[PDB]
Design a protein around this ligand. Structure first.
Ligand SMILES: OC[C@H]1O[C@H](O[C@H]2[C@H](O)[C@@H](O)[C@@H](O)O[C@@H]2CO)[C@H](O)[C@@H](O)[C@@H]1O
Length: 727
């Protein structure tokens, strides 16, 4: 046996297609499920990896070339007698690198739908509409309303003056030659932004807002595909479907899309899928059942096409399809669509000028490394297609100071069941290789790290009454990114960073940072390398010191067990006023134990100290070490945490040039022999302590405020005193 699961976008006929699925189950006994998940075009390549996905997937052909290259689609194998049933150009739309990768279903193209009662003669040009809108606003109506959230609906205007996505030149598509940035495209988008300034259209208008407006008669026009006609029938609005308005004398060029059905390559039911598609859905009866639910446009099945051809609504669809351009199916299409999805929104909402919104989409459409990261982000935040975002306006590769080209700011609602608070999630762009053209980072192929190999992320606890994420952390990430770039020393999970300043420039006690693998962002494959995601975690100086004395990983584990200091997701709360050792005093024990068993990472310190006798190599037999109180409290960590693990530890002087290097029995390099344990080169003193003597010395050192204290022995002496160093 086997099941058959189908995905089809919500605006299409999923109920008519379900009827066809019923007839299949009747005649065959195989159950056909139909689902219309949100953002199915993005979710497919996500869950086709785990094969948790549909046996069949429906969408415009432009997406498929991208699926096919990722090996997510099985090649379809119709015989000649079936191929003759559909038009040759619709098989063209589903052909990628020589193979048929999906069955074509229907041809879609945007048309101008107008309310005959409100507007008997629809305007032949775009420029007519501002005028036409004043007349309609007088009697309380509007002239035009259509989806401005999706570039698919505003692209006909942008392309009217000849703006394009990729150029069909010399037999192929030129992937770097994108045309969203030329005069024609700016002329089209400038005109769209104008309409919104003069309040003929509103930037907030999405699909369901426009559809409701037109179907209640509140607006005289709209732009939409054959699928929308069904609901205008139910509204009983007296409407007609016609050619789109011209712009500057040239026609609107809508991207024509062929609704196609592909078969999952991980489907165990490729044969059942071939039967359902070839001998049920693709016939006069099957296509009819889907057309009745929501019109398909001009179907690819020659027979049922000639039957509907009379329908003037179809005639107007193909008239606009002729003036438009058929969408390419190359993998780079999704990139292009996203680049423009943003450009149009930013340019319309006022976030950005038309001239720079399109100049942005130009570099970002071409740019593979950027795309991949956005793809993960969109995997985490499906319902935030346009996040507040900081952009470096003077790019880092034109001499600019700030190396992060972008920093995106998402809203993470957290988890109420697992005690993870609502917070802001920042992701950076530019530490990895975004463009792969040797502009910022050396191109090192698909094998190895992409640029530095990671991007920063940050999770900031949401303060109360905060409508939007603050922007100060984007500044911080610019600071860290500069730190990495200039030094060329990369970071790993567990590393620490001394910042010595409250991260937000308020008095916050959080003044440092540990780094750790972001708990949600998953490493990505890029055509320029691999990109993992490091997350910054704010910490107090007390905690930064623990991480230096013990380890980064160990302290990170602790921040996870104290919810108000990070929790499982290590969220930074900038209003935290207590260290984790003051919240849970019994944690200090865990660290000390962690040091006794793992050992200290601290190889030395710059502190107030000196030594005295009681270039050459002076061999001595009586030594008097002098420390500050602060650096004297270190001595037990030096003994227990390093000399016992067979490691050296060095105190540098900083008031001079003296130094004291404690050396265990049996470490290479070092000139105290233990025939004569106290040798000096210099101001450079090395003193070797046997395990026996270290263990007893630790008993004798118990750190109260008495000074100067002094400890003595048969070997040696050790003072801790106060001002002498600074004087
Ligand atoms: O807007 C970007 C989007 O455009 C196209 O999506 C269309 C789709 O082709 C239509 O059948 C209908 O469902 O409207 C969609 C836009 O809301 C592209 O096919 C798609 O890849 C792209 O992301």
């Amino acid at each position: 046996e086997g099941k058959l699961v189908i995905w089809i976008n919500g605006d299409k006929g999923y109920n008519g297609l379900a009827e066809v699925g019923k007839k299949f189950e009747k005649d065959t006994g195989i159950k056909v499920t139909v689902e219309h998940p949100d953002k199915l075009e993005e979710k497919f390549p996500q869950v086709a990896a785990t094969g948790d996905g549909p046996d069949i997937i429906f969408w415009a052909h432009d997406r498929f070339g991208g699926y096919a290259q990722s090996g997510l689609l099985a090649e379809i194998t119709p015989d000649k007698a079936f191929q003759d049933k559909l038009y040759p150009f619709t098989w063209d739309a589903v052909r990628y690198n020589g193979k048929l990768i999906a069955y074509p279903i229907a041809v879609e193209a945007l048309s101008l739908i107008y309310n005959k009662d409100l507007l008997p003669n629809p305007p032949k040009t775009w420029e007519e509409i501002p005028a036409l809108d004043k007349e309609l606003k007088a009697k309380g109506k509007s002239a035009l309303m259509f989806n401005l959230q999706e570039p698919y609906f505003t692209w006909p205007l942008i392309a009217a003056d000849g703006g394009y996505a990729f150029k069909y030149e010399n037999g192929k598509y030129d992937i770097k030659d994108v045309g969203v940035d030329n005069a024609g495209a700016k002329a089209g988008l400038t005109f769209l932004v104008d309409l919104i300034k003069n309040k003929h259209m509103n930037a907030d208008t999405d699909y369901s807002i426009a559809e409701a407006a037109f179907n209640k008669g509140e607006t005289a026009m709209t732009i939409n595909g054959p699928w929308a006609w069904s609901n205008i029938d139910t509204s009983k609005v007296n409407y007609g479907v016609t050619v789109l308005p011209t712009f500057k004398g040239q026609p609107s060029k809508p991207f024509v899309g062929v609704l196609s059905a592909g078969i999952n390559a991980a489907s165990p039911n490729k044969e059942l899928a071939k039967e359902f598609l070839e001998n049920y859905l693709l016939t006069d009866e099957g296509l009819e059942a889907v057309n009745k639910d929501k019109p398909l446009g001009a179907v690819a099945l020659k027979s049922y096409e000639e039957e509907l051809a009379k329908d003037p609504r179809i005639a107007a669809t193909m008239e606009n399809a002729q003036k438009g351009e058929i969408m390419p199916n190359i993998p780079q299409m999704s990139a292009f669509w996203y680049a423009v999805r943003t450009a149009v929104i930013n340019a319309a909402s006022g976030r950005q000028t038309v001239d720079a919104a399109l100049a942005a989409a130009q570099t970002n459409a071409a740019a593979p490394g950027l795309h991949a990261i956005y793809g993960e982000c969109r995997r985490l935040y499906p319902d935030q297609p346009n996040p507040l975002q900081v952009t470096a306006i003077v790019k880092y590769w034109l001499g600019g100071p700030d190396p992060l080209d972008y920093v995106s700011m998402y809203r993470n609602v957290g988890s109420p069941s697992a005690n993870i608070p609502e917070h802001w999630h920042y992701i950076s762009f530019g530490l990895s290789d975004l463009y792969g053209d040797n502009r910022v980072h050396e191109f090192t192929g698909t094998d190895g790290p992409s640029g530095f190999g990671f991007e920063l992320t940050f999770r900031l606890k949401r303060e109360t009454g905060e409508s939007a994420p603050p922007t100060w952390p984007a500044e911080l990430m610019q600071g860290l990114a500069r730190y990495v770039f200039q030094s060329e020393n990369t970071f790993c999970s567990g590393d620490h960073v001394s910042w010595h300043s409250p991260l937000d420039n308020s008095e916050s006690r959080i003044q440092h940072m540990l780094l750790t693998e972001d708990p949600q962002m998953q490493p990505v494959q890029t055509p320029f390398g691999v990109v993992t995601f490091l997350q910054i975690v704010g910490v107090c100086t007390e905690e930064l010191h623990s991480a230096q004395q013990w380890n980064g990983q160990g302290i990170l584990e602790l921040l996870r067990t104290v919810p108000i200091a990070g929790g499982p997701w290590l969220i930074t709360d900038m209003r935290r006023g207590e260290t984790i050792f003051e919240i849970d005093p019994h944690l200090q024990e865990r660290v000390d134990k962690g040091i006794e068993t793992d050992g200290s990472n601290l190889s030395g310190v710059s502190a107030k100290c000196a030594w005295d006798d009681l270039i050459r190599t002076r061999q001595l037999e009586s030594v008097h070490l002098k420390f500050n109180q602060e650096s004297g409290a270190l001595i037990p960590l030096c003994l227990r945490g390093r000399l016992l693990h067979g490691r050296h530890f060095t105190y540098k002087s900083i008031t001079g040039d003296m130094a004291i290097t404690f050396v265990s029995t049996g470490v290479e390099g070092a000139f105290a022999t233990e025939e004569h344990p106290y040798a000096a080169h210099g101001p450079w003193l090395q003193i070797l302590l046997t395990e026996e003597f270290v263990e007893k010395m630790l008993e004798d050192l118990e750190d109260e405020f008495k000074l100067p204290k002094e400890y003595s022995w048969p070997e040696k002496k050790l003072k801790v005193s106060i001002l002498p160093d600074v004087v």
